[PDB]
Amino acid sequence: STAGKVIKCKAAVLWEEKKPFSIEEVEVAPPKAHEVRIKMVATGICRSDDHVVSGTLVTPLPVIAGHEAAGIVESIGEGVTTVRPGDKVIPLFTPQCGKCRVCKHPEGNFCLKNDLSMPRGTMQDGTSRFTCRGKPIHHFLGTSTFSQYTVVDEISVAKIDAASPLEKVCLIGCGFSTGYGSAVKVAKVTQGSTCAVFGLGGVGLSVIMGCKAAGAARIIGIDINKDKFAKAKEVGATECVNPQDYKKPIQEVLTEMSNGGVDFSFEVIGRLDTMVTALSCCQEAYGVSVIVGVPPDSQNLSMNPMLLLSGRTWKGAIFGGFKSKDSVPKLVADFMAKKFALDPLITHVLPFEKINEGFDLLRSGESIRTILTF
Amino acid sequence: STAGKVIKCKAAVLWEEKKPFSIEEVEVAPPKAHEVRIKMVATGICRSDDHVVSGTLVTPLPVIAGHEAAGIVESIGEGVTTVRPGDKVIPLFTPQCGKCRVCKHPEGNFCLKNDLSMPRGTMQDGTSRFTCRGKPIHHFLGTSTFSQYTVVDEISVAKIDAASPLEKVCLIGCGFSTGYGSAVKVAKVTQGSTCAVFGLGGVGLSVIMGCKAAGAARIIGIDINKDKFAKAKEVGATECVNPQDYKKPIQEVLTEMSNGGVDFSFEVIGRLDTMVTALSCCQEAYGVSVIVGVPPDSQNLSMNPMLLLSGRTWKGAIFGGFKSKDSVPKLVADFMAKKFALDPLITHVLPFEKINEGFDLLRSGESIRTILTF
Ligand SMILES: NC(=O)c1ccc[n+]([C@@H]2O[C@H](COP(=O)([O-])OP(=O)([O-])OC[C@H]3O[C@@H](n4cnc5c(N)[nH+]cnc54)[C@H](O)[C@@H]3O)[C@@H](O)[C@H]2O)c1
Ligand SMILES: NC(=O)c1ccc[n+]([C@@H]2O[C@H](COP(=O)([O-])OP(=O)([O-])OC[C@H]3O[C@@H](n4cnc5c(N)[nH+]cnc54)[C@H](O)[C@@H]3O)[C@@H](O)[C@H]2O)c1
Ligand SMILES: OCc1c(F)c(F)c(F)c(F)c1F
Ligand SMILES: OCc1c(F)c(F)c(F)c(F)c1F
Ligand SMILES: [Zn+2]
Ligand SMILES: [Zn+2]
Ligand SMILES: [Zn+2]
Ligand SMILES: [Zn+2]
């Protein structure tokens, strides 16, 4: 039995920015009250994890990163009611405490208990469950999924279908749900509309899936890497454009293509310039633009507010706008009912021990999602 | 007797920026096909007219400004079907051609025939109906209401109730409808919500009216001129704050007052800094901020897009989001049925000949709306 005991296991520790992960033994404390210890089964490599490595996202180091995953409950602390040992679960990088003003709001999902805005890199109680070489190691977004075992707060975990394939549904923990919800819930894409999707990685592909599901008539994919176009078309893009092919700015190209601007645009990269371009290419009177990408820490964009005064709507969201604990189980149920596909997003499946190679595939432009299996 | 003939009348011509208007004789050509010549009865002095004088708003000079008005049709050009001589009318600074993609869109109101985005200062045909001292004089927004007679395109005029009091309902041509619609139509303020209104002039007062009509529980007015607070409370503000009273930035004050951010905020001034402050003070996960004020020409704001990524919505609108020709007559009908009040906005009345004194009153901070009578 491991319940109630410290577990020694393998994890990928990030000791400092711009260095490879170190795959080594960590100690994982047992869960305290209202905490859940999970044996990880699969975790995805998301660009946001690379942002921690690159310094694009600032979070306390050293750290166990990883936020898109699925696993099986090993043990629960006192007072846990929503999961039991043996349950399949997805950690929730956006929690759902159910009690704060956001949780109670019909349209908010960015629960005030989150560790995104002002990250401490701890459990809710302000302490860490991880040690490595005698040193405390930080958590990441309350999830820390780059470990054979993690500990999460109960508000940061959802129980899912016991028959779920964990090596696929881990994507519901971040990239699929984020893109899909950005289209269907946040933008509320309409039937017959024209959509523009900037960035054709895992998240942008999921935005395309949602735009197609919503009945868009035209879905224009934009990426500087033309190797991304074939898969974008497979999942619903009607056209793809590479800005590097044009003498004019791409907002002008897209405005012309759409006979005066698109209905919905999405920034799914993380660049300040593309955020402004995406806003500009939506129709000036009634267009909607959604920011999904995460830009470099503490950098401001510059824009002319006449873009908004004419009638545009500009919004952003975390996790597709989904209230996390309510939505994850339903998304998995919908996947099990064949309502959407996840295989198009998965280009590589590697053992966990190859985490660095998986990040190199992302950085080189060669992968969409690599799933790491424990 | 004047139908088909040039009319000589008095208008207020702006020859140069940063100068008084010159009340002098102009020649007003008869209406061409699909044009309407209107005898003006009353026109309001709106801050946007002042922006033309100050250079905040760039439009070709020399010009006959004025855009908030009501009058009586003197004559119609060939092919006009929607008004007749003797009808009471409001000129529409935002046209409604009824044929473009925006006019056909359920939400859009910024008709593509507008003369706001890239002002030419002409009729729809690219020519002027005004001569002064033998020189052609520009139109403004297709309306040019600072004249005893103007000529407008048919898509820029609405017929209104024959019993309408024109010295009141001119405010439906801009300031009332813009602020009211910004709350009820653009923001879609909800019952029980907390609203923050930056700027307590005529437009911001109208926003407050709209927020109160929509059922807001708290309406916080923000102005650096505390003389504006008594009327703001009369029309529905629950509390007023002056940024100059505080050591902390007002977005922090408002976030504290609203226990974590407001539901709806409105920028009703025209400053880049207050546009960002207004966005910041709405709740980070589900807040909505609407830009109403007109900022200085060609200037960009700087902002951190993480404000949006957490869930905020940022939008702007012209004329309260109202499709102009459909909406203006209905708004007048609702006024005649006492569904809203206009008298709280009217602080001064002057003859047209005292236009410069009217502008002095606005610039000093003393007036809300001065109504000029012809
Ligand atoms: N809002 C959320 O909740 C949330 C969740 C998940 C991911 N993210 C962010 O979303 C973004 C996309 O993540 P991902 O899909 O995993 O990343 P990814 O797989 O790296 O995809 C990004 C795509 O952008 C393309 N690209 C780069 N520069 C440009 C350019 N100038 N113009 C057009 N295309 C360009 C690039 O070739 C690539 O295909 C990242 O910034 C993530 O951090 C946000
Ligand atoms: N979007 C539209 O369709 C539309 C139509 C009508 C008016 N406008 C614009 O709306 C704005 C307001 O017009 P208005 O109500 O006639 O103008 P106004 O009567 O000048 O009112 C502006 C108010 O802002 C106050 N103010 C100035 N600076 C600050 C500050 N830093 N903080 C807080 N309050 C401050 C000022 O004291 C005044 O009471 C102007 O920019 C107009 O050009 C836009
Ligand atoms: O990919 C999801 C994701 C985000 F959207 C962020 F805004 C963030 F800061 C982060 F760490 C993260 F993992
Ligand atoms: O007051 C209404 C109004 C506007 F909202 C503008 F954006 C504009 F450019 C203008 F000239 C105007 F009069
Ligand atoms: Zn919460
Ligand atoms: Zn992610
Ligand atoms: Zn139109
Ligand atoms: Zn105005």
Side-chain angles (χ1 to χ4, degrees):
Chain A
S1 65
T2 51
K5 308 175 189 163
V6 175
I7 288 176
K8 283 184 166 158
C9 71
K10 196 183 298 191
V13 174
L14 188 70
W15 291 100
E16 82 181 84
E17 71 167 3
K18 302 183 179 198
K19 295 294 186 181
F21 296 93
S22 184
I23 300 147
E24 61 177 293
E25 182 168 73
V26 303
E27 300 80 50
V28 187
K32 297 192 188 164
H34 297 107
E35 301 174 1
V36 179
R37 185 158 64 177
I38 303 169
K39 186 176 188 178
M40 298 323 303
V41 172
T43 186
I45 295 172
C46 175
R47 179 63 73 169
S48 297
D49 303 300
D50 184 62
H51 293 336
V52 174
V53 181
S54 76
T56 286
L57 265 181
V58 176
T59 197
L61 304 181
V63 70
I64 296 177
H67 63 292
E68 181 179 81
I72 298 169
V73 178
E74 172 272 347
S75 68
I76 58 170
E78 191 168 34
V80 168
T81 60
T82 57
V83 300
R84 288 161 164 175
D87 283 349
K88 287 178 173 178
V89 290
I90 291 173
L92 310 172
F93 78 82
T94 302
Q96 185 175 357
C97 75
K99 294 168 171 160
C100 73
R101 211 173 52 178
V102 176
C103 288
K104 297 182 158 151
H105 189 284
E107 305 287 326
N109 77 327
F110 191 51
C111 173
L112 293 162
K113 300 282 196 184
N114 77 80
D115 195 43
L116 276 78
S117 284
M118 310 230 74
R120 298 186 279 174
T122 61
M123 300 295 292
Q124 287 295 326
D125 77 353
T127 69
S128 167
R129 304 283 166 282
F130 298 122
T131 66
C132 186
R133 317 189 189 175
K135 307 177 213 165
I137 308 297
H138 294 94
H139 296 244
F140 178 59
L141 313 180
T143 59
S144 287
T145 69
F146 296 164
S147 183
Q148 288 174 335
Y149 292 81
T150 190
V151 182
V152 302
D153 294 283
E154 184 174 23
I155 64 166
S156 297
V157 68
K159 182 183 173 181
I160 64 166
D161 188 334
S164 316
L166 297 183
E167 80 284 356
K168 304 193 178 312
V169 298
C170 57
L171 293 182
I172 291 165
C174 185
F176 171 79
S177 302
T178 295
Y180 195 84
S182 295
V184 309
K185 187 171 182 66
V186 181
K188 300 160 196 79
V189 170
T190 53
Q191 191 151 24
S193 68
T194 293
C195 293
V197 180
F198 291 83
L200 303 173
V203 186
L205 296 170
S206 299
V207 174
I208 292 169
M209 291 178 175
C211 291
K212 180 182 167 155
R218 291 180 68 187
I219 302 164
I220 306 165
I222 302 104
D223 203 300
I224 60 168
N225 182 353
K226 67 178 172 190
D227 293 341
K228 301 291 171 171
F229 297 171
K231 180 59 63 65
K233 288 178 174 187
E234 290 174 24
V235 301
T238 53
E239 292 182 291
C240 293
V241 300
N242 184 344
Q244 298 173 339
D245 290 346
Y246 293 88
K247 295 184 182 178
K248 294 171 169 161
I250 200 69
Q251 63 192 45
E252 294 179 18
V253 172
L254 291 164
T255 299
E256 182 272 342
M257 287 171 69
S258 60
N259 296 293
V262 301
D263 299 286
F264 303 94
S265 64
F266 302 84
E267 201 282 5
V268 207
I269 305 159
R271 296 173 58 88
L272 298 177
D273 56 2
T274 46
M275 288 168 194
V276 179
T277 289
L279 176 65
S280 300
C281 83
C282 80
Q283 203 287 327
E284 65 180 358
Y286 57 74
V288 172
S289 188
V290 178
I291 302 179
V292 188
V294 174
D297 181 77
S298 298
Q299 301 195 19
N300 280 7
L301 61 78
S302 171
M303 63 81 70
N304 188 323
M306 287 299 315
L307 295 174
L308 296 175
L309 197 65
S310 51
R312 294 184 180 83
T313 301
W314 204 11
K315 69 199 304 189
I318 301 298
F319 197 57
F322 287 119
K323 292 182 180 286
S324 61
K325 190 158 181 160
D326 292 334
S327 301
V328 161
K330 298 189 270 161
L331 289 163
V332 168
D334 287 351
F335 175 66
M336 295 303 285
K338 318 287 173 61
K339 300 194 177 168
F340 57 87
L342 294 173
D343 286 351
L345 301 179
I346 301 168
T347 58
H348 295 83
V349 184
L350 304 181
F352 175 65
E353 292 73 22
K354 294 188 189 297
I355 183 161
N356 290 308
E357 294 86 340
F359 275 79
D360 292 336
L361 289 165
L362 182 67
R363 291 168 190 143
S364 73
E366 176 171 348
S367 53
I368 299 295
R369 285 299 202 258
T370 294
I371 306 303
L372 299 176
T373 56
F374 290 88
Chain B
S1 109
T2 57
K5 299 183 191 161
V6 174
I7 290 175
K8 286 184 178 175
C9 71
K10 299 308 183 291
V13 176
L14 185 73
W15 293 102
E16 211 176 313
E17 281 179 33
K18 301 180 186 173
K19 297 298 179 162
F21 295 93
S22 176
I23 294 278
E24 63 179 289
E25 178 168 276
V26 302
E27 298 179 277
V28 186
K32 302 188 175 209
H34 299 102
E35 305 172 358
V36 177
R37 184 158 62 180
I38 302 169
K39 182 179 170 174
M40 294 324 302
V41 172
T43 187
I45 294 174
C46 177
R47 178 64 70 170
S48 296
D49 300 301
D50 186 64
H51 290 337
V52 172
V53 183
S54 71
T56 287
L57 262 183
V58 175
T59 195
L61 309 172
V63 65
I64 296 173
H67 66 287
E68 184 182 78
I72 297 168
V73 178
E74 170 274 343
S75 66
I76 58 172
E78 291 180 349
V80 168
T81 62
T82 60
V83 302
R84 294 183 292 251
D87 281 349
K88 288 180 174 173
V89 290
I90 291 174
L92 311 175
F93 76 81
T94 303
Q96 185 176 354
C97 74
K99 298 169 173 182
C100 74
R101 207 172 60 172
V102 177
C103 284
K104 295 188 173 288
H105 191 278
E107 306 290 317
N109 78 327
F110 191 55
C111 172
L112 291 167
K113 303 282 194 184
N114 76 82
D115 194 44
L116 278 74
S117 285
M118 297 244 304
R120 299 185 281 173
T122 65
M123 298 292 292
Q124 287 293 330
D125 75 0
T127 69
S128 169
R129 300 284 164 283
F130 294 123
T131 306
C132 185
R133 312 183 186 189
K135 299 166 205 222
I137 310 295
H138 292 94
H139 296 245
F140 178 55
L141 312 182
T143 60
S144 288
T145 70
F146 294 168
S147 181
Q148 291 171 332
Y149 289 84
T150 190
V151 183
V152 302
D153 291 286
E154 185 176 19
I155 64 167
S156 295
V157 69
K159 180 178 175 184
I160 63 165
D161 182 336
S164 307
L166 296 185
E167 81 288 359
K168 316 281 199 190
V169 298
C170 54
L171 292 180
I172 292 164
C174 185
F176 172 80
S177 304
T178 294
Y180 193 86
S182 294
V184 307
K185 182 177 281 307
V186 182
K188 309 183 187 56
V189 169
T190 51
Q191 192 155 24
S193 66
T194 294
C195 296
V197 182
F198 292 79
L200 303 174
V203 185
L205 296 170
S206 299
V207 174
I208 291 170
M209 291 174 175
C211 288
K212 180 176 178 179
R218 290 179 70 185
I219 303 166
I220 303 161
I222 304 106
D223 203 303
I224 57 170
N225 182 355
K226 65 180 196 293
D227 297 345
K228 299 291 167 176
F229 293 172
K231 177 60 62 64
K233 286 181 168 172
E234 290 166 36
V235 301
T238 54
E239 63 224 280
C240 290
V241 298
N242 180 349
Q244 301 172 338
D245 289 347
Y246 294 85
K247 295 185 192 182
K248 284 172 166 166
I250 199 70
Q251 59 197 45
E252 189 170 0
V253 173
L254 291 166
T255 298
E256 292 167 3
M257 286 172 73
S258 59
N259 297 292
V262 302
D263 298 287
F264 303 93
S265 65
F266 300 85
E267 199 284 4
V268 207
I269 304 160
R271 295 174 58 89
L272 299 178
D273 56 4
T274 45
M275 290 168 189
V276 180
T277 289
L279 177 66
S280 302
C281 82
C282 77
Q283 199 289 323
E284 65 177 0
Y286 55 76
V288 174
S289 189
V290 181
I291 303 179
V292 186
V294 169
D297 183 71
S298 297
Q299 303 193 29
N300 280 13
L301 62 75
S302 171
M303 63 80 73
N304 186 325
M306 294 302 310
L307 292 173
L308 299 175
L309 196 69
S310 50
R312 294 186 180 80
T313 303
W314 202 14
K315 70 203 301 184
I318 300 298
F319 195 57
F322 286 118
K323 291 179 181 286
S324 61
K325 191 158 180 159
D326 292 335
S327 302
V328 163
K330 174 55 168 160
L331 288 162
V332 169
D334 286 349
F335 173 69
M336 293 305 284
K338 297 202 80 184
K339 302 303 189 187
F340 57 86
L342 297 173
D343 285 350
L345 303 178
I346 300 167
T347 57
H348 298 81
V349 293
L350 288 172
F352 176 64
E353 294 76 23
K354 295 180 179 169
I355 184 162
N356 288 311
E357 166 179 16
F359 278 80
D360 297 335
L361 288 163
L362 178 69
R363 295 169 185 143
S364 71
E366 188 189 323
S367 57
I368 297 294
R369 282 299 199 263
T370 298
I371 308 302
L372 298 179
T373 291
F374 292 94

